[PDB]
């Protein structure tokens, strides 16, 4: 019997689809993380961070989840919290989408909106205040540094890719937000299955902090339009040691690529999906990668 006890267990087993108007003779294949509870990759880390907090006793009946997240992590935690019966508080700037506020409210989140001028720093600050006010009551899962993030990718996302490609996958391209996807995937394929694939991080040209760091240059973040990626810092969940290459993509190209995925491939992916594909396409059209099977994470849906 293939029935899930709750919606948290239903994560993953996302499909690989071949692109027809990207790459060279279908050397580019996409993994559609849009096909998940809460419509993004974050469903996996949402599920596993909660599961892990349960196993280690940091999360019990009565204790509340608190997390600062402007994005899909909040949505993921909301779904899992509802599916597993936890109260949850999320903090972010008043400067959010009314659709996200409403959907988050719909999901049963105690929403706490911080000054828009103060940005995500204000939201971390506030989340920290809330936990500090009653440490026995509130648990911060800390998506950027919690090992349960890349662990789920090593246990599910990566093995799915290995399985689906009969281990013929040669290159994995993934935008970096928390870094968990690239970390966990790379660890699975390289460490557990033992194939020396090329792991390609993607980040905005507008905020190329990984590229700058690896070049030994001054780190100079900037604002960009590609949601999900470009934190403006190297997260603790980004394992530099497994990264073979870093490609930068600009906002406009990422957006054009997302639109092309929709109109040409019939795939409903978000801007960060566009970024990932733009980067993969670049490498796919180098002779050196002409006979390599390239797997691209599409993190979310449109």
């Amino acid at each position: 019997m293939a029935i899930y006890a709750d919606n948290s267990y239903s994560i993953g087993n996302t499909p690989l689809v071949r692109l027809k108007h990207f790459g060279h003779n279908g050397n580019v294949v996409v993994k559609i993380e849009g096909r998940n509870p809460s419509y993004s990759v974050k469903c996996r880390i949402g599920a596993n961070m909660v599961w892990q907090a349960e196993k280690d006793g940091t999360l019990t009946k009565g204790k509340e989840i608190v997390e600062p997240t402007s994005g899909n992590t909040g949505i993921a935690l909301a779904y899992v919290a509802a599916a597993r019966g936890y109260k949850i508080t999320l903090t972010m700037p008043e400067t959010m989408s009314i659709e996200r506020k409403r959907l988050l409210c719909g999901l049963g989140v105690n929403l706490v909106l911080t000054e828009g001028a103060k940005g995500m720093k204000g939201a971390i600050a506030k989340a920290e205040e809330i936990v500090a006010s009653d440490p026995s009551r509130y648990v911060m899962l800390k998506q950027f540094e919690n090992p349960a993030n890349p662990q789920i990718h090593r246990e599910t996302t990566g093995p799915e890719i290995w399985k689906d490609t009969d281990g013929k996958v040669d290159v994995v391209v993934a935008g970096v937000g928390t870094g968990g996807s690239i970390t966990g995937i790379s660890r699975a394929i390289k460490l557990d299955f033992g194939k020396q694939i090329t792991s390609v991080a993607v980040e905005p040209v507008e905020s190329p902090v990984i590229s700058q760091t690896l070049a030994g240059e001054e780190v100079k973040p900037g604002p960009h339009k590609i949601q999900g990626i470009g934190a403006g810092f190297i997260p603790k969940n980004l394992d530099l040691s497994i990264i073979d290459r870093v490609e930068t993509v600009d906002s406009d190209t990422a957006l054009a690529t997302a639109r092309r995925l929709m109109a040409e491939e019939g795939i409903l992916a978000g801007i960060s999906s566009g970024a990932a594909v733009a980067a993969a396409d670049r490498l796919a059209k180098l002779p050196e990668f002409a006979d390599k099977l390239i797997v691209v994470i599409l993190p979310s849906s449109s």
């Binding site: 995500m120 960009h224 339009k225 934190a231």
Partner: peptide
């Protein structure tokens, strides 16, 4: 993420 310290 959704926003680490960037975006829009």
């Amino acid at each position: 993420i959704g926003d680490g310290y960037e975006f829009t």
